Design an enzyme around this catalytic site. Structure first.
Site, PDB file in Angstrom:
ATOM      1  N   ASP A 174       0.831  -1.195   0.000  1.00  0.00           N
ATOM      2  CA  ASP A 174       0.000   0.000   0.000  1.00  0.00           C
ATOM      3  C   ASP A 174       0.869   1.251   0.000  1.00  0.00           C
ATOM      4  O   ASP A 174       1.861   1.339   0.728  1.00  0.00           O
ATOM      5  CB  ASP A 174      -0.926  -0.001   1.218  1.00  0.00           C
TER       6      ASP A 174
ATOM      7  N   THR B 229      -4.859   4.258  -2.768  1.00  0.00           N
ATOM      8  CA  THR B 229      -3.912   5.280  -2.336  1.00  0.00           C
ATOM      9  C   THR B 229      -2.748   5.418  -3.307  1.00  0.00           C
ATOM     10  O   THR B 229      -2.234   6.526  -3.502  1.00  0.00           O
ATOM     11  CB  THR B 229      -3.393   4.958  -0.935  1.00  0.00           C
ATOM     12  N   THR B 230      -2.318   4.314  -3.922  1.00  0.00           N
ATOM     13  CA  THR B 230      -1.225   4.385  -4.885  1.00  0.00           C
ATOM     14  C   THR B 230      -1.690   4.996  -6.202  1.00  0.00           C
ATOM     15  O   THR B 230      -0.960   5.778  -6.822  1.00  0.00           O
ATOM     16  CB  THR B 230      -0.635   2.993  -5.114  1.00  0.00           C
TER      17      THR B 230
ATOM     18  N   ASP C 201      -8.223  -3.319   2.814  1.00  0.00           N
ATOM     19  CA  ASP C 201      -8.521  -2.557   1.607  1.00  0.00           C
ATOM     20  C   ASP C 201      -9.652  -3.189   0.806  1.00  0.00           C
ATOM     21  O   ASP C 201     -10.405  -2.473   0.135  1.00  0.00           O
ATOM     22  CB  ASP C 201      -7.269  -2.435   0.738  1.00  0.00           C
TER      23      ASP C 201
HETATM   24  N1  LIG Z   1      -5.902  -9.855 -13.954  1.00  0.00           N
HETATM   25  C1  LIG Z   1      -5.780  -8.547 -14.281  1.00  0.00           C
HETATM   26  N2  LIG Z   1      -5.713  -8.152 -15.571  1.00  0.00           N
HETATM   27  C2  LIG Z   1      -5.593  -6.854 -15.909  1.00  0.00           C
HETATM   28  N3  LIG Z   1      -5.531  -5.852 -15.015  1.00  0.00           N
HETATM   29  C3  LIG Z   1      -5.589  -6.104 -13.685  1.00  0.00           C
HETATM   30  C4  LIG Z   1      -5.719  -7.498 -13.235  1.00  0.00           C
HETATM   31  N4  LIG Z   1      -5.751  -7.466 -11.890  1.00  0.00           N
HETATM   32  C5  LIG Z   1      -5.650  -6.167 -11.511  1.00  0.00           C
HETATM   33  N5  LIG Z   1      -5.550  -5.355 -12.580  1.00  0.00           N
HETATM   34  C6  LIG Z   1      -5.426  -3.877 -12.536  1.00  0.00           C
HETATM   35  O1  LIG Z   1      -4.325  -3.506 -11.706  1.00  0.00           O
HETATM   36  C7  LIG Z   1      -4.666  -2.371 -10.908  1.00  0.00           C
HETATM   37  C8  LIG Z   1      -4.089  -2.519  -9.507  1.00  0.00           C
HETATM   38  O2  LIG Z   1      -4.054  -1.242  -8.878  1.00  0.00           O
HETATM   39  P1  LIG Z   1      -3.577  -1.099  -7.349  1.00  0.00           P
HETATM   40  O3  LIG Z   1      -2.103  -1.420  -7.278  1.00  0.00           O
HETATM   41  O4  LIG Z   1      -4.559  -1.854  -6.485  1.00  0.00           O
HETATM   42  O5  LIG Z   1      -3.765   0.477  -7.087  1.00  0.00           O
HETATM   43  P2  LIG Z   1      -3.894   1.046  -5.588  1.00  0.00           P
HETATM   44  O6  LIG Z   1      -2.711   0.448  -4.865  1.00  0.00           O
HETATM   45  O7  LIG Z   1      -3.827   2.543  -5.766  1.00  0.00           O
HETATM   46  O8  LIG Z   1      -5.234   0.533  -5.125  1.00  0.00           O
HETATM   47  C9  LIG Z   1      -6.184  -2.276 -10.884  1.00  0.00           C
HETATM   48  O9  LIG Z   1      -6.597  -0.949 -11.220  1.00  0.00           O
HETATM   49  C10 LIG Z   1      -6.676  -3.256 -11.930  1.00  0.00           C
HETATM   50  O10 LIG Z   1      -7.420  -2.561 -12.933  1.00  0.00           O
END
Ligand SMILES: Nc1ncnc2c1ncn2[C@@H]1O[C@H](COP(=O)(O)OP(=O)(O)O)[C@@H](O)[C@H]1O
Ligand SMILES: Nc1ncnc2c1ncn2[C@@H]1O[C@H](COP(=O)(O)OP(=O)(O)O)[C@@H](O)[C@H]1O
Ligand SMILES: Nc1ncnc2c1ncn2[C@@H]1O[C@H](COP(=O)(O)OP(=O)(O)O)[C@@H](O)[C@H]1O
Ligand SMILES: [Mg+2]
Ligand SMILES: [Mg+2]
Ligand SMILES: [Mg+2]
Lengths: 536, 344, 192, 518, 155, 48, 71
Positions: free
Chosen positions: D57, D90-91, D384
């Site tokens: 996070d 948050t990221t 989260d």
């Molecule tokens: N299997 C997948 N295929 C394509 N995109 C994905 C998959 N799993 C997650 N994602 C994308 O990766 C992103 C992960 O973001 P994340 O690191 O959770 O951001 P934050 O840390 O700000 O919540 C998500 O926005 C999602 O759309």
């Protein structure tokens, strides 16, 4: 020296002395360093500035009063400009950045006159006479809007609101901010449209959500939640009712004890058994006095022991604990209730009345906050501001605070002017015209005051990327051809230099203080000769 | 002259007395100019700069005489004899002026100092300031002036009575009306709140039944002093000792104004303003000891709310509210007003 | 066991000089009646948990239980009360009024072994209705470093049986599972 | 003339605008590699006690790492608000707000664009981005079956960026059922998370009941059936009454023994009133001494001590009972019901397990991990996921993820850029290119191409297909409806609104003033 | 002098405790006002409850700290101090015709000045000067003249 | 030898890693691995 | 500035006359016992170590280092 140490004053070598032309040059350059900082933030095209506190907290604002307040300085001349903007924010609350630019403009024109051999008092005497000629000229040009009814009077409040909301961060929502700032005065005000009480409006900030969630709520917003949260969060009134019958108590729930230190001596078991029954009889009596009065939500200043958690839960009586004394005054005003000092004085006439009492979840965890709404027009209006950043929630407070300072000044009768640099240009040509009739030694004094008023319109052209020469020449040529004073600088570039079509409106009481605070402060600065500054 | 002390306290003064008070003079002979500056400011209040300039010149003209064979006492014979004929010469300069019945002398006292160019305004308040003081009294406190940071000095106005700062916010303050048509001011030294009474607190109660009566007795005694104030119809209550929220809330339902924390110097001006008296107990309060005025209105000045006493037929109290941008501006104006009143 | 000391602050005021005689007689009488009820149940061993505020056993009460031939042990950890309750089958007695014979345990021999300058109290035999018996082992050694390691060596031994009782079945050690899994995986890794 | 004191750092010129933009670059580049399911965790070195913390996070990373740059503190505060408001993203807010400054840096330097013009450009650009998400939002709350299924797909997206992406299929049902137990409650303090060290990571389960770490005091049996649970908050140990001015005046110790005995009679009379309820179990949040505990032995009532007040509210919602004090009146008081109560042991510490409880408004989650760093990560990973699903019960609108939501917003931004004309067209189009970075970084962490792969997703939407998305597993364009990648609509608006407001902060700072530290 | 403490057994004694102390000072100060005493000289701090009834009858209040300052006051009026608060003896009462308060050096000073009849002893000399340094030696210069008067007695 | 006056001689890998402070964060995790083996099972904690 | 680097402070008046007379008297006071047929002797210690024992007036004065300039 004759060979013996000569010391008139303690800390001889520590203190320094400034005199002559070098003492005057250091004072003018000290104001130029403060001016060039404020001139960048002046106007709707201005920019904010980061204020780093010694404790690590940061502050981002363009306000000349807030920037100079947290600013750590050394020279005392720059410290005099700190209280200059503070004098503008405390009373009027508008134009804090304009008093610094105008004061330094008077000092810049005075430095040129000092080098010509003019006595500093003769310079200050010319600014005092030129200040009254500019105020008397603008006072004749403005018109009285009090002849309009309450429908049009709200429009003038919306005009001056949108102007003060500019130049500051989160200026995209100014359309809704201007509507919410006027409705607060519409609800809280005297029937004669005079001497409105500002203290009845409280500013409560909240960190979270987005700026679009800001809305007006008439009531009390507390940081304390319902005690023993087994009760429903949202309290609803009875089917038929006069109201919710809110109760306010400054006395915690305890068995009666003397304020003085007391000693209760139990000499026998029978005397100890009577204390057991006497204990439970008081908690049963205190909860019955509230039920007989019809009250629902009970507010306690010092809280209460866990004994009454289930007691008030059986009777369905909401309760809060550890409410501040200042908030208790805020509660009785909204619900029009009366604080009850003790259960013996508790009556149904002292209970407050509000529309609904409920709490919001806000974010994920955060804290629980209580919200009160009113069913009609009341004397309490609480501002509710949200934001995605701690800096946004902070600055938005004083952004709307200064917006409320402009509206409360319009409550005063028969003072209005149009902004956008149109006021300084109108008062500039009136002073320059008198310089030709008076002549004498003071002829150059009116010229320095006229050139200083034109600095504000020229500063507006700098932040907007315009030509200060071509803009000032157009404004001066317009006032000579026609008597309309409504032509001014446009930093938004929508055209129509007439301020009547652009609706920009400023309080005259705010613009009148800008000349008084700038002229009277330079009169004291020009009198400074010997500067004695002790070492820290 | 701008002077900054070791505490970083900015002060701007041209007065010979104030300049010498800021600096700490360790020179034995140079401290004589400080004594004559404080002695001139205490009685007359004006001329402190001229005395130091004149005293230092007498030593400068005596400097070439000391280098010669002139004895030290021979020089003092010239100054002591010339000052004897100089005082008698001043009496010839002065005129009885019993004809023509404050206006001219107050304008010349403001010279060399701030607001002197404003003398068309502040001088009008200096005339009526001392006239409220009867002969043989002429109290120096009743001319007292309060300083409010912020604002413009031209916005000041004259008040027939004392105005003091609240310094404390009461929970039942707003419930009290801020506008009185015919207020009755009552000065009291009593302390109204729930606390130990006199100098000691101890309670001995054997039985639980008598333990309830001890608490109820404390509430009745505090309320007994509150009922005696309401029966006399006193709209305004002033006290030196603190007043808790219990007595403030009781006065809120009765539409009675309450105040506390006021300094001893301010309440001394209240007795002279409304012509009242000080009552240290609530049992001796009588209707003829309560003062009054024409109206009472609380106005906020520079984020500070004050109580306005004005409209009294006979009032010896004069209090002015001054404004200015710098913290020294509000200080220099009263410094000019305090020196101008001593002239008239 | 001590003179009465309620948690609430008390004040004993002596009005008459003859009252001081009755006070000293009732203080020892309060401690005597507590010891008289213990002899009625024929309880020769008393265990007292660690005391807070006032002391566990007064010195005046020590003479009462000594003349009656009753062993007294105090300063027992509160966390050890659960082990002593199920181990000896004795229900703890928190009040002199609730003290009875049915709440007392039973033991064949209670003796304090003193050897090599060290004293230890051991109980021989347990007679009661208990569905969860206990066990205790005394550990000796040269120094604290060896004794602590002797106990740590027992923890690893007690966990071997715990894994066998919880999960039935076992394999062969000494390097058997490491080589066997490596060989069975190498055959399947080539097919992937 | 220097008006400022000694050791006062200030930049009135280009150095200020350079330090403000570059200061956000180091913040954006730190959390850049943490975006996406292929992202890597970060390590935090503590300055004291040598306590290492590994978290994916961005909210914890920015708050733990000291940052003296005010431009960095702006991106740290918006991450704390994003964690406290929605609970996730948050990221994404820190990265998106940093890319807005990247496109704004080239407009002031190269394109020579006014700073407020870039700010006024994002105003009209964000209006089209928020309106694009409204038309793309689908409300499935009309069907309880379709709404419950969407709660599983949302949990799979949140748990994918954390270390749980392998077992997230097994943990999607555990997080979905936990929200269904709350019955629309958005409070996460009602769910208890017990972290257990050791065992397989996939052994984490969710029991129906309340798992309490506390155990019965002394003699209470471990397992008992048909037990009525009662909760009492107050006192009931060496009662002090109320007022502190009570004392015992004793003439002779003979009367003093009767006064202390009366205190035990008050304890016996209060426990005797508890037996009138017919309960087999009693629970006190305050610790219970030895004397009142022995009174429950003859009554056959269980006793539990030292219960935390935040666990009392959790316990009251599991049993469906009511907190009961002032036992004099049995009628107005309510008790909880439980089918069976057994004391189990997980690891070295025995636990108190409940089963067959009437009310399901609260539960307890048990986690298993190889290290405490994975345990601290497993709790924050579910915190989260449970926060988004809790806000989903309130606002049921959902928006597809996987790079789709970011590119759909950029479609409406490019349309409004033509009608504005002026010099704001460079600022409006800069907001669209800033939306390209979020799906681009998703491909960068997976080792894919940042140009041709992004162009395939961009060209597919302009052909009339709004359901196209990015597939990081196969490295191609796939349908998001079939893969089950969807996020809450509140999360989509929060990232766009927080980044747009945070970008308007640093762009308004011409001058940075640093006072002498204290 | 030892352990001054308010003892209230029941609420009946508490209600009359506030009005009881008011009647004590009233009864003591009434006997002084009946004797025609318009001024009272105190040697220590006076409570506020005692100053209330003194303002009722229009009696002045004087604070005389330490000792020697109060000792020379009775030599002026010819009075004999007594510790009790009861009615003073008429033979021990002093005579002062006027008591005035005026501004001399900027502060309020009290005037004990006597007149031709009923002469007084230990008179004071008001010394005015511009500098405090001159005021110190002139005070010793006057003491040199006072000491010269002592030389007119013993020989 | 602990920082205090206590000295521990132990062949148990968990006790060794617990009383031996490590300055490397990833190597600090090896202490928690031995704790996971000792808590759940208790045997063979030096092999993991 | 310091103006004169050599004795900016000055001793003038009777203070300089007393220092000249007192130091001159101290020169004669040590040799008072050196006059007459019964006169005593004086021993002098130079930094070189040579001992000079005589009642002569000049031999005593030239071997003594006097810091007083007028003496
Ligand atoms: N299997 C997948 N295929 C394509 N995109 C994905 C998959 N799993 C997650 N994602 C994308 O990766 C992103 C992960 O973001 P994340 O690191 O959770 O951001 P934050 O840390 O700000 O919540 C998500 O926005 C999602 O759309
Ligand atoms: N939208 C606008 N159009 C024209 N003039 C404006 C506008 N906003 C502000 N101004 C002008 O800029 C000046 C400074 O306003 P601002 O910086 O917003 O607050 P302050 O008056 O407190 O400095 C005002 O005198 C006003 O005339
Ligand atoms: N008698 C033996 N002969 C050969 N090898 C053995 C014998 N006993 C144990 N081993 C091997 O040595 C290893 C010892 O591990 P051990 O030190 O007991 O781990 P821990 O101390 O963590 O329980 C075991 O894995 C086992 O396979
Ligand atoms: Mg403004
Ligand atoms: Mg003067
Ligand atoms: Mg996420």
């Amino acid at each position: 020296e004759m060979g013996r140490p000569f010391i008139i004053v303690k800390d001889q070598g520590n203190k320094k002395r400034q005199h002559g032309l070098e003492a005057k040059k250091s004072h003018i350059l000290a104001a130029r360093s403060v001016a060039s900082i404020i001139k960048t933030s002046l106007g709707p095209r201005g920019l904010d500035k980061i204020l780093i506190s010694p404790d690590g907290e940061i502050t981002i604002t363009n306000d000349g009063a807030t920037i100079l307040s947290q600013m750590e300085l050394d020279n005392e001349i720059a410290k005099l400009l700190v209280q200059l903007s503070k004098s503008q924010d405390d009373e009027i609350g508008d134009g804090t950045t304009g008093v610094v630019v105008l004061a330094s403009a008077l000092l810049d024109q005075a430095l040129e006159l000092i080098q010509k051999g003019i006595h500093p008092i003769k310079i200050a005497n010319g600014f005092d006479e030129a200040a009254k000629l500019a105020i008397s000229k603008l006072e004749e040009t403005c018109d009285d809007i009090s002849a309009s009814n309450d429908e049009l009077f709200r429009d003038f409040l919306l005009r001056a609101a949108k102007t003060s909301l500019g130049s500051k961060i989160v200026s995209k929502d100014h359309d809704r901010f201007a509507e919410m700032a006027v409705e607060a005065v519409i609800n809280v005000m005297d029937k004669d449209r005079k001497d409105v009480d500002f203290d009845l409006i409280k500013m409560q900030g909240r960190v979270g959500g987005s700026i679009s969630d800001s809305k007006l709520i008439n009531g009390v917003i507390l940081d304390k939640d319902f005690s023993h949260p087994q009760m429903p969060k949202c309290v609803l009134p009875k089917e038929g009712s006069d109201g919710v019958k809110l109760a306010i108590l400054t006395c915690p729930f305890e068995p009666p004890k003397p304020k003085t230190k007391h000693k209760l001596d139990i000499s026998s078991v029978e005397e100890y058994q009577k204390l057991q029954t006497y204990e439970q009889d008081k908690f049963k009596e205190m909860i019955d006095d509230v039920k007989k009065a019809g009250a629902d939500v009970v507010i306690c200043q010092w809280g209460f022991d866990d004994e009454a958690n289930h007691l008030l839960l059986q009777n369905d009586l909401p309760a809060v604990r550890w409410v501040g004394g200042q908030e208790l005054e805020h509660i009785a005003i909204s619900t029009n209730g009366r604080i009850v000092p003790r259960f013996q004085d508790l009556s149904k006439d002292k209970l407050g009345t509000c529309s609904r009492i409920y709490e919001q979840e806000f974010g994920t965890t955060k804290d629980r906050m209580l919200i009160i709404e009113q069913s009609k027009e009341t004397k309490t209006v609480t501002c509710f501001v949200r934001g995605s950043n701690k800096m946004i929630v902070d600055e938005a407070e004083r952004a709307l605070h200064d917006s409320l300072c402009v509206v409360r000044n319009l409550v005063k009768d028969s003072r209005v002017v149009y902004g956008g640099g149109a006021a300084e240009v109108t008062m500039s040509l009136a002073v320059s015209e008198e310089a030709d009739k008076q002549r004498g030694i003071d002829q150059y004094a009116f010229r320095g005051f006229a050139q200083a008023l034109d600095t504000i319109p020229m500063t507006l052209a700098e932040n907007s990327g315009l030509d200060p020469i071509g803009t000032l020449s157009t404004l001066k040529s317009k006032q000579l051809k026609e008597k309309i004073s409504n032509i001014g600088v446009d930093c938004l570039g929508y055209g129509s230099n007439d301020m009547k079509e652009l609706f920009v409106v400023d309080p005259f009481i705010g613009k009148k203080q800008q000349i008084l605070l700038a002229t009277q402060l330079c009169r004291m600065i020009l009198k400074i000769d010997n500067v004695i500054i002790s070492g820290k | 002259i701008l002077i900054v002390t070791s505490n970083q306290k900015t002060t701007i003064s041209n007065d010979g007395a104030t300049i010498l008070k800021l600096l700490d003079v360790v020179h034995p002979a140079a401290k004589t100019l400080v004594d004559i500056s404080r002695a001139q400011d205490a009685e007359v209040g004006d001329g402190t700069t001229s005395v130091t300039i004149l005293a230092g010149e007498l030593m400068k003209e005596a400097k070439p005489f000391l280098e010669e064979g002139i004895s030290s006492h021979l020089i003092m014979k010239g100054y002591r004899k010339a000052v004897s004929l100089a005082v008698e010469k001043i009496n010839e300069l002065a005129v009885d002026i019993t004809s023509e019945k404050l206006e001219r002398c107050a304008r010349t006292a403001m010279s060399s100092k701030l607001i002197h160019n404003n003398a068309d305004f502040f001088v009008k308040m200096c005339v009526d300031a001392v006239l409220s003081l009867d002969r043989n009294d002429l109290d120096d406190k009743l001319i007292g002036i309060k300083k409010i940071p912020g604002g413009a000095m031209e916005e000041s106005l004259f008040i027939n009575g004392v105005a003091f700062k609240k310094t404390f916010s009461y929970a039942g303050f707003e419930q009290q009306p801020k506008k009185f048509n015919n207020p009755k001011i009552l000065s009291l030294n009593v302390e109204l709140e729930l606390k130990a009474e006199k100098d000691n607190a101890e309670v001995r109660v054997e039985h639980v039944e008598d333990y309830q009566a001890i608490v109820d007795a404390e509430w009745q005694l505090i309320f007994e002093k509150l009922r005696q104030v309401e029966e006399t119809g006193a709209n305004i209550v002033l006290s030196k000792l603190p007043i808790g929220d219990l007595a403030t809330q009781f006065f809120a339902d009765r539409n009675i104004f309450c105040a506390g924390r006021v300094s001893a110097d301010d309440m001394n001006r209240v007795i002279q303003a409304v012509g009242g008296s000080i009552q240290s107990t609530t049992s001796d309060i009588k209707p003829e000891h309560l003062g009054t005025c024409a109206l009472f209105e609380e106005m906020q000045i520079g984020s500070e709310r004050y109580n306005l006493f004005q409209g009294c037929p006979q009032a010896k109290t004069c209090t002015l509210l001054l404004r200015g941008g710098a913290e020294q501006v509000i200080a220099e104006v009263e410094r000019s007003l305090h020196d101008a009143i001593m002239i008239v | 066991i001590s003179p009465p000391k309620p948690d609430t602050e008390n004040n004993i005021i002596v009005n008459d000089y003859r009252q001081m005689d009755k006070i000293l007689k009732e203080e020892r009488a309060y401690l005597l009646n507590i010891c008289k009820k213990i002899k009625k149940a024929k309880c020769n061993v008393l265990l007292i948990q660690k005391s807070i505020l006032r002391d566990a056993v007064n010195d005046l009460a020590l003479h009462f239980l000594s003349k009656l031939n009753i062993m007294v042990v105090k300063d027992i950890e509160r966390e050890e009360i659960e082990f002593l309750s199920k181990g000896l089958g004795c229900k703890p007695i928190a009040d002199i009024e609730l003290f009875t014979e049915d709440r007392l345990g039973s033991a064949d021999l209670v003796e304090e072994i003193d050897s090599d300058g060290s004293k230890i109290v051991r109980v021989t035999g347990i007679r009661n209705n208990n569905a969860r018996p206990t066990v205790s082992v005394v550990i000796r050694g040269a120094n604290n470093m060896i004794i602590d390691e002797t106990e740590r060596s027992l923890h690893d031994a007690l966990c071997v049986i715990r894994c066998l009782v919880k999960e039935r079945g076992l394999i062969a050690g000494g390097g058997a599972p490491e080589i066997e899994i490596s060989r069975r995986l190498s055959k399947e890794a080539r097919s992937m | 003339v220097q008006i400022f004191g000694d050791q006062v750092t200030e930049e009135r010129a280009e150095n200020a605008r350079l330090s403000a933009f570059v200061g956000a670059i180091a913040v954006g580049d730190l959390v850049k590699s943490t975006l996406g399911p292929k992202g890597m965790d970060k390590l935090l070195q503590s300055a004291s006690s040598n306590t290492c913390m590994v978290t994916n996070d961005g909210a914890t990373i920015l708050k733990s790492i000291p940052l003296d740059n005010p431009a960095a503190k702006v991106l740290v505060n918006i991450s704390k608000v994003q964690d406290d408001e929605v609970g996730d993203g948050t990221t994404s807010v820190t990265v998106l707000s940093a890319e807005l400054l990247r496109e704004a840096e080239k407009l002031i330097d190269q394109s020579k664009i006014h700073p407020q013009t870039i700010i006024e450009g994002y105003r009209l650009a964000s209006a089209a981005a928020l309106d694009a998400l409204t038309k793309a939002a689908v409300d499935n709350s009309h069907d309880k079956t379709m709404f419950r299924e969407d709660l599983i797909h949302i949990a799979k997206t949140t748990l994918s960026s954390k270390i749980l992406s392998q077992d997230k299929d097994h943990f999607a049902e555990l997080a979905t059922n936990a929200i269904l137990r709350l019955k629309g409650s958005t409070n996460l303090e009602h769910i208890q998370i017990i972290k257990i060290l050791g065992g397989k990571l996939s052994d984490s389960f969710l029991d129906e009941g309340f798992i309490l770490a506390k155990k019965f005091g002394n003699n209470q049996p471990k397992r008992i059936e048909n037990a009525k649970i009662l909760i009492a908050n107050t006192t009931l140990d060496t009662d002090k009454v109320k007022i502190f001015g009570t004392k015992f005046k004793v003439d002779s110790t003979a009367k003093l023994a009767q006064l202390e005995k009366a205190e035990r009679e008050k304890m016996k009379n209060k426990i005797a009133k508890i037996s009138k309820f017919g309960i087999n179990t009693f629970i006190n949040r305050q610790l219970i001494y030895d004397y009142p505990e022995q009174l429950f032995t003859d009554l056959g009532i269980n006793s539990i001590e030292h219960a935390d007040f935040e666990g009392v509210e959790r316990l009251a919602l599991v049993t469906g009972g009511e907190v009961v004090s002032t036992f004099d009146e049995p009628s107005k008081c309510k008790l909880g019901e439980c089918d069976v109560i057994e004391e189990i042991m997980l690891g070295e510490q025995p636990f108190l397990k409940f089963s067959g409880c009437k009310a399901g408004e609260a539960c307890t989650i048990v986690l298993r991990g190889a290290t405490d760093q994975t345990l601290d990560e497993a709790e924050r990973s579910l915190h989260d996921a449970l926060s988004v699903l809790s806000q989903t019960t309130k606002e049921t609108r959902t928006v597809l993820g996987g790079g789709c939501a970011e590119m759909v917003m950029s479609k409406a931004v490019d349309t409004e850029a033509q009608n504005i004309d002026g010099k704001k067209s460079l600022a409006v189009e800069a907001f669209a290119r800033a939306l390209r970075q979020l799906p681009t970084i998703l491909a960068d962490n997976a080792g894919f191409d940042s140009s041709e792969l992004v162009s395939k997703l961009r060209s597919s939407i302009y052909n009339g297909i709004s359901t196209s998305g990015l597939d990081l597993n196969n490295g191609t364009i796939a349908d998001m409806r079939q893969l089950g990648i969807v996020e809450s609509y509140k999360l989509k608006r929060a990232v766009v609104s927080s980044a747009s407001e945070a970008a308007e902060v640093l762009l308004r700072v011409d001058n940075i003033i640093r006072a002498r530290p204290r | 002098e030892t352990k001054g403490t308010v003892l209230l057994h029941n609420a009946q004694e508490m209600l009359d405790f506030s009005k009881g102390e008011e009647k004590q000072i009233d009864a003591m100060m009434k006997e002084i006002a009946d004797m025609g005493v318009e001024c009272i000289v105190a040697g220590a701090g006076v409570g506020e409850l005692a100053l209330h009834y003194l303002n009722r009858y229009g009696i002045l209040v004087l604070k005389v700290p330490s000792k020697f300052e109060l000792r020379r006051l009775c030599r002026v009026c010819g009075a004999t101090p007594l510790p009790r608060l009861g009615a003073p003896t008429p033979e021990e009462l002093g005579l002062v015709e006027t008591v005035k308060t005026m501004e001399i050096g900027g502060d309020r000073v009290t005037v004990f000045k006597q007149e031709q009849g009923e002469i007084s002893r230990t008179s004071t000399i008001i010394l005015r000067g511009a500098t405090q340094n001159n005021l110190d030696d002139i005070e010793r210069a006057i003491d040199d003249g006072v000491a010269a008067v002592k030389g007119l007695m013993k020989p | 030898k602990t920082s205090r006056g206590e000295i521990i001689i132990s062949n148990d890998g968990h006790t060794i890693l617990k009383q031996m402070a490590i300055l490397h964060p990833v190597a600090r995790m090896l202490v928690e691995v031995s704790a996971a083996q000792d808590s759940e099972a208790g045997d063979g904690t030096t092999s993991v | 500035v310091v103006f004169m680097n050599a004795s900016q402070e000055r001793t003038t008046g009777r203070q300089a006359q007393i220092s000249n007379i007192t130091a001159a008297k101290a020169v004669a006071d040590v040799i008072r016992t050196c006059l007459g047929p019964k006169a005593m002797l004086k021993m002098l210690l130079d930094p070189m170590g040579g001992l000079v024992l005589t009642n002569d007036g000049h031999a005593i004065l030239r071997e003594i280092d006097v810091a007083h300039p007028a003496a």
